[PDB]
Enzyme design. Structure first.
Site, mmCIF file in Angstrom:
data_model
loop_
_atom_site.group_PDB
_atom_site.id
_atom_site.type_symbol
_atom_site.label_atom_id
_atom_site.label_comp_id
_atom_site.label_asym_id
_atom_site.label_seq_id
_atom_site.Cartn_x
_atom_site.Cartn_y
_atom_site.Cartn_z
ATOM 1 N N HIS C 69 0.846 -1.183 0.000
ATOM 2 C CA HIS C 69 0.000 0.000 0.000
ATOM 3 C C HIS C 69 0.896 1.253 0.000
ATOM 4 O O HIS C 69 1.164 1.830 -1.057
ATOM 5 C CB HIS C 69 -0.924 0.025 1.231
ATOM 6 C CG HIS C 69 -1.833 1.218 1.278
ATOM 7 N ND1 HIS C 69 -2.100 1.876 2.451
ATOM 8 C CD2 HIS C 69 -2.535 1.796 0.274
ATOM 9 C CE1 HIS C 69 -2.958 2.830 2.144
ATOM 10 N NE2 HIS C 69 -3.252 2.822 0.837
ATOM 11 N N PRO C 87 -0.006 -1.988 10.529
ATOM 12 C CA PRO C 87 -0.614 -0.995 11.418
ATOM 13 C C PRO C 87 -0.945 0.347 10.779
ATOM 14 O O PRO C 87 -1.826 1.051 11.256
ATOM 15 C CB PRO C 87 0.424 -0.854 12.528
ATOM 16 C CG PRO C 87 1.701 -1.073 11.818
ATOM 17 C CD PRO C 87 1.377 -2.271 10.941
ATOM 18 N N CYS C 88 -0.293 0.670 9.666
ATOM 19 C CA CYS C 88 -0.529 1.951 9.009
ATOM 20 C C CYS C 88 -1.934 2.213 8.511
ATOM 21 O O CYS C 88 -2.521 3.246 8.835
ATOM 22 C CB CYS C 88 0.514 2.195 7.939
ATOM 23 S SG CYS C 88 2.112 2.373 8.776
ATOM 24 N N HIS C 89 -2.488 1.290 7.738
ATOM 25 C CA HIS C 89 -3.851 1.462 7.243
ATOM 26 C C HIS C 89 -4.664 0.169 7.297
ATOM 27 O O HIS C 89 -5.689 0.047 6.633
ATOM 28 C CB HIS C 89 -3.848 2.044 5.833
ATOM 29 C CG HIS C 89 -3.011 3.273 5.694
ATOM 30 N ND1 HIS C 89 -1.721 3.209 5.245
ATOM 31 C CD2 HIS C 89 -3.314 4.557 6.008
ATOM 32 C CE1 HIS C 89 -1.262 4.443 5.297
ATOM 33 N NE2 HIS C 89 -2.190 5.293 5.752
ATOM 34 N N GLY C 90 -4.183 -0.800 8.069
ATOM 35 C CA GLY C 90 -4.904 -2.048 8.233
ATOM 36 C C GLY C 90 -4.970 -3.060 7.106
ATOM 37 O O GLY C 90 -6.053 -3.438 6.678
#
Ligand code: FES
Lengths: 127, 107, 123
Positions: C69, C87-90
């Site tokens: 991503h 953890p950044c955008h799931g």
């Protein structure tokens, strides 16, 4: 989980064509690996019959290559075995199984069918 | 065409002790040797692939060694459902061929 | 060109090593995980790949730990698919490192590598 359910005529008359269907659920035939057919003779000697890839390529045992035909039906997700002009030799329990293939470890049949016992008898049976 | 020779042929043992089966091929196979377990009820499962790698679900008590043309299949204890027929195949080239078989009985 | 000693890596453990400033993920997969990986239907994957198309030896998962991503490093042994979670955008990755849920459009990239006994050579 992947499951292989086998079905078909458990008794054919000699000189006729044996037909077995292998229904697969939980994974598509077109998705990846190899789809095999093998037989177990009463004298306990497993023999590899052949396969059909996810692409549709066939690969048969040279011992039976001129008689059999392993086709499939992507829609219903099931492959079939068709052993022509049977004989008392062809009396065995047939198994359909999936084999993976990793460039290092090679092939390995990880998912096996229930096992369909076929008898080449001249007897009569209610269809 | 390559052919294996499963020896000993149908040898029995006790209710919990080591046992060593083997598979010798006519030609030379790298390590491409699998081992199957045929239950008395007709159910066949994969136990070992590539001469030593365990499959999913197979107990830790199952080993696997050898190379070149001589192979093995060791067990820790037959306690209690290790009773079945064991096979072995090769896959270095088509067609794949299995062994003669090796039934395991309990006296 | 990094050399990693596979003989040092325990059973079901993750090891992260640097290669060209990028993190390389290496997991010694368990037999159960190997089955979990090769028993998933392509219809459930936005980026259709078999576990075999991604690994040479089913025991060693070797990939670039860079979320497809926006570049964060996915967290090991987390997520709803038994693999990695970004953890950044799931974004959730499975045990083969394929994208299963989230904004990431592709599976974790596999770098070029060769085996040599007890050690693999990434590069
Ligand atoms: S960078 Fe991993 S989800 Fe956005």
């Amino acid at each position: 989980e992947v499951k292989l359910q086998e079905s078909g005529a458990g008794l054919v008359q000699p000189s006729q064509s044996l037909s077995l269907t292998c229904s697969v659920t939980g994974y598509s035939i077109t998705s990846g690996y190899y789809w095999n057919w093998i037989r177990l003779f009463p004298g306990n000697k497993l023999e590899w019959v052949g396969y059909i890839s996810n692409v549709g390529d066939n690969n048969y045992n040279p011992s039976l290559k001129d008689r059999l035909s392993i086709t499939r039906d992507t829609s219903k997700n099931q492959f079939f075995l068709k052993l022509n002009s049977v004989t008392t030799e062809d009396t065995a329990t047939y198994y359909c199984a999936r084999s993976e293939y990793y460039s290092v470890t090679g092939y390995a049949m990880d998912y096996w069918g229930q096992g369909t016992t076929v008898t080449v008898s001249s007897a009569w049976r209610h269809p | 065409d390559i052919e294996l020779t499963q020896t000993p042929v149908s040898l029995a043992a006790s209710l919990g002790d080591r046992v060593t089966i083997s598979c010798r091929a006519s030609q030379d196979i790298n390590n491409f040797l699998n081992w199957y377990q045929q239950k008395p009820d007709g159910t066949i499962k994969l136990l070992i692939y590539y001469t030593s790698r365990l499959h999913a679900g197979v107990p830790s008590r199952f080993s696997g060694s050898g190379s070149g043309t001589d192979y093995s299949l060791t067990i820790s204890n037959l306690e209690p459902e290790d009773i079945a027929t064991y096979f072995c195949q090769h896959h270095i080239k088509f067609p794949w061929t299995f062994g003669a078989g090796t039934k395991l009985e309990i006296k | 060109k990094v050399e990693v000693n596979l003989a040092a890596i325990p059973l079901g453990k993750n090891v992260v090593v640097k290669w060209q400033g990028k993190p390389v993920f290496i997991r010694h997969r368990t037999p159960h995980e190997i089955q979990e990986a090769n028993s998933v239907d392509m219809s459930a994957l936005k980026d259709p790949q078999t576990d075999a198309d991604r690994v040479k030896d089913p025991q060693w998962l070797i990939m670039l730990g860079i979320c497809t991503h926006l570049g964060c490093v996915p967290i090991g042994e987390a997520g709803d698919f038994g693999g990695w979670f970004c953890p950044c955008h799931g974004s959730h990755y499975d045990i083969s490192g394929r994208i299963r849920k989230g904004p990431a459009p592709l599976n974790l990239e596999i770098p070029a590598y060769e085996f040599d006994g007890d050690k693999v050579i990434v590069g």
